[PDB]
Amino acid sequence: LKKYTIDLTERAEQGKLDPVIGRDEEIRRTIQVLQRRTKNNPVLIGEPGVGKTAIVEGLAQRIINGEVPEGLKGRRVLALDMGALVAGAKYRGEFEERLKGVLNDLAKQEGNVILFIDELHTMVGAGKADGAMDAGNMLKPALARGELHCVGATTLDEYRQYIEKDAALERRFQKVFVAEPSVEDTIAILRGLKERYELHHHVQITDPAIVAAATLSHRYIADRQLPDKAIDLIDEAASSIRMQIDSKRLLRNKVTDAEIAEVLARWTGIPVSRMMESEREKLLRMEQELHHRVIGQNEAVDAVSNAIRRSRAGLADPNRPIGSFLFLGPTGVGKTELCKALANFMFDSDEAMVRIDMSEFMEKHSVSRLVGAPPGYVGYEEGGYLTEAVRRRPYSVILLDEVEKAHPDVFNILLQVLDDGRLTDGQGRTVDFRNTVVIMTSNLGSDLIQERFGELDYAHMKELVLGVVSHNFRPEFINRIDEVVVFHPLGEQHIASIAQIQLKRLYKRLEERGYEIHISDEALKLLSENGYDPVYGARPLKRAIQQQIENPLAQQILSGELVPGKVIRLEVNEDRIVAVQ
């Protein structure tokens, strides 16, 4: 008994237990089960990192401090470990002499000992080798007779496929559900626990670093549960500052939310850290920073930058994505380019744009590729194309390209992402679109968008295109769109400004090779004859570097006069261009 079971009650007299704050409805319900006549076995069902191990450490602190009823007064909470019972059990019945050694020491205790079996699912099928199980089949009489007082603490899905499968052991435990606390309920958890970390780290932790250790944990960390990550963050931040005082008021020890969001940005990647950066320079110039790489399209950025300012002010709907856009209009105008800009603004990486082409979803059978296959079908455990991608990046700009080429029954899949920000996978797991920006480019009115842009100034392309030919006949999808955005086609004013960032990002490395080129002003309209298109758009400009500028170097090698090291020009003549050394 003293070889296996850790005694939590004498670990509470030394003050070695964490102070437990709250939990008084789940501790009282635990004592209500622990005082039952038969089957006095609570199982603290929760999720990993909810506090179900620090409920019995708030029961064992309670027995010593005496807030338990008489009947649980003066008990002992022993923490049996089923990993130390299957530890060296090689031979036949070395495990069964460990339980029947522990179970017979618990009967000498005449009911003065509470047994905390943490992770009961490790008891289902312990020393099971021969046949019939040996741990939750040896406890099974003394669990039903109300004899050993077994506080279990498993999680809900580990209860579901370990303990619920043994239906004769499932009834010997009573589910004391430990729901995770809310964001305000874990501040008081962490306000009293902060001094137990101040005495260990020799680090002062402010309640600003605690009110933001939980609002940033809950919002940004979605796989963990709340009083496990909020105390991870303060322990990581107090260890990050504990370097700054050891090795090399301005050499601080205080944790503030500057250090808490810095650890969380180092965990997840979301840079909302401090507004003492150029973010004050960035929050009102949010519409013109997009204009750095989205040339023109003032109706486009004033729809997307005003919607992502609407949520950074905490004013947008938290049961809806950050933005739901329909980018109908011409091709090669700034549709796909703004979403790269919007990803390079919000999550500052244009690799965080989940592009989905809806020409792959032409027919109705190809809708379970986005959402996932049902149980029992091909591609079930794989997932969906949209739902699993949003589980990869929950903070991403979803591009749904040419949605008018989808099936009509894929807008039905796209009614719940727009309205509620949810999409359930084929495996019954719901993915959360509340942090994504769902932008949907289309070409459904583009014939009438292009002809009327220099006629109807800035608002009449929105009205009166809807109803004769365009989307109103299927009306449930239009009103779920946040802003329907029409795109004015590009004149010569924009493609001269759009054809300047072709090699601007590669510009900052390749100087010493022998290349630095300033703007030449004579070959401007050579690219503005194939690239500046009223019909097909500005996308043939990207081929107008692959067809116009890059050809007579990489194949004209063998003739023996043109060798690299000299910067090329282009002039308006019938030249078949030369290059002088």
Ligand X SMILES: Nc1ncnc2c1ncn2[C@@H]1O[C@H](COP(=O)(O)OP(=O)(O)O)[C@@H](O)[C@H]1O
Ligand Y SMILES: Nc1ncnc2c1ncn2[C@@H]1O[C@H](COP(=O)(O)OP(=O)(O)OP(O)(O)=S)[C@@H](O)[C@H]1O
**What is the footprint of ligand Y within residues 176-215 (CB under 6 A)?**
189, 193
Token look-up 């305000």 returns: 184
Residue 52 interacting entry, from a second copy, ligand X, ligand Y, none, C-beta within 5 to 8 Å by type: ligand Y
- Of 259, 257, 5, 16, the C-alpha closest to 151 is 5
Residues of the chain by 3-state class (helix, strand, coil), percent to 5: 35, 10, 55
CA distance 461 to 198: 62
**Among residues 184, 195, 357, 492, the one that binds a second copy under rule CB under 8 A:** 357
Answer yes or no whether residue 208 interacts with ligand X by CB under 6 A.
Answer: no
- Does 23 interact with ligand Y (rule: CB under 6 A)? yes
Q: Which is nearer to ligand X, 332 or 383 (CB)?
A: 332
Among positions 8, 12, 17, 21, the unique one binding ligand X when judged by CB under 6 A = 21
Count, residues near a second copy per rule CB under 8 A: 116
410 token code pair: 């894929």
How near is the Cβ of 52 to ligand X at its closest, in Å?
Answer: 9
Asked if 99 and 85 count as a contact pair (C-beta separation under 8 A), the reply is yes
* Residue 506, burial from CB neighbour count under 10 angstroms (0-12, 13-18, 19+): exposed
At residue 559, φ and ψ (nearest 5 deg) are -70, -35
Tokens 């932008």 belong to 439
Residue with tokens 């008489």: 70
Q: Decide if residue 36 touches ligand Y (CB under 6 A).
A: no
- What residues between 407 and 426 interact with a second copy by CB under 8 A? 412, 422
By the rule CB under 6 A, 22 interacts with ligand X = yes
- Residue in 22, 271, 394, 540 binding ligand Y, rule: CB under 6 A: 22
- What minimum distance in Å lies between the beta carbon of 409 and ligand X? 18
* Residue 303 binds ligand X (CB under 6 A): no
Work out whether 20 is an interface residue with a second copy (CB under 8 A). Answer: no
Could you tell me the two tokens for 413? Answer: 């899949």
In angstroms, the Cα distances linking 384 to 44, 367, 378, 390 are: 34, 9, 11, 10
Binds a second copy (CB under 8 A): choice among 379, 391, 452, 515: 379
> Three-state secondary structure along 273-314?
CCCCCCHHHHHCCCCHHHHCCCCCCHHHHHHHCCCCHHHHCC
Report which DSSP code applies to 220. H
Q: Tell me if 225 sits within 8 A of 49, measured CB to CB.
A: yes
**Of these, 23, 98, 175, 293, which contacts a second copy (CB under 8 A)?**
175
Among 314, 454, 475, 565, binds a second copy (CB under 8 A): 475
Under rule CB under 8 A, residue 195 binds a second copy: no
Distance CA 148, CA 117 (A): 11
Contact 398, 354 (CB under 8 A): yes
If binding is defined by CB under 6 A, does position 20 make contact with ligand Y? Answer: yes
Give whichever of 409 and 522 is closer to a second copy, judged by the CB atom: 409
Choose the contact partner of 86 out of ligand X, a second copy, ligand Y, none; CB within 5 to 8 A by kind.
a second copy
In one letter, which amino acid is 436? Answer: T
How far apart are alpha carbons 12 and 543 in whole angstroms? 73
Under rule CB under 8 A, residue 55 binds a second copy: no
453 token code pair: 């842009």
**Rule CB under 8 A: which of 493-532 touch a second copy?**
512
Shortest approach of ligand Y to residue 279 CB, angstroms? 32
Q: Give the residue with the Cβ less far from a second copy, 168 or 572.
A: 168
Is 67 near ligand Y (CB under 6 A)?
no
d(CA 393, CA 386): 10
Is residue 48 near ligand X by the rule CB under 6 A? yes
The site for ligand Y, by CB under 6 A, has a size of 20
Stretch that binds ligand Y, among 223-231, 308-316, 482-490, 516-524 (CB under 6 A): 223-231
Q: Which tokens is 554 given?
A: 């990489």
Instruction: Give the chain's radius of gyration (CA, Å).
Output: 33
18 binds ligand X per the rule CB under 6 A: yes
CA 251 to chain centre: 34
Binding pattern for the stretch 221-260 against a second copy, x by CB under 8 A and - elsewhere: -x-----x--xx--xx-xxx-xx-xxx-------------
548 binds ligand X (CB under 6 A): no
- Binder among 36, 100, 202, 542 for ligand X (CB under 6 A): 542
Among residues 49, 372, 445, 489, the one that binds ligand Y under rule CB under 6 A = 49
CA atoms within 13 A on the CB side of 513: 13
Contacts of 377 (CB under 8 A, 6+ apart): 368, 426
List interacting residues with ligand Y (CB under 6 A).
Answer: 18, 20-23, 38, 46, 48-54, 171, 189, 193, 227-228, 231
List interacting residues with ligand X (CB under 6 A).
Answer: 18, 20-23, 48-49, 51, 172, 181, 185, 189, 227-228, 231, 293-297, 331-337, 355, 479, 498, 502, 536-539, 541-542
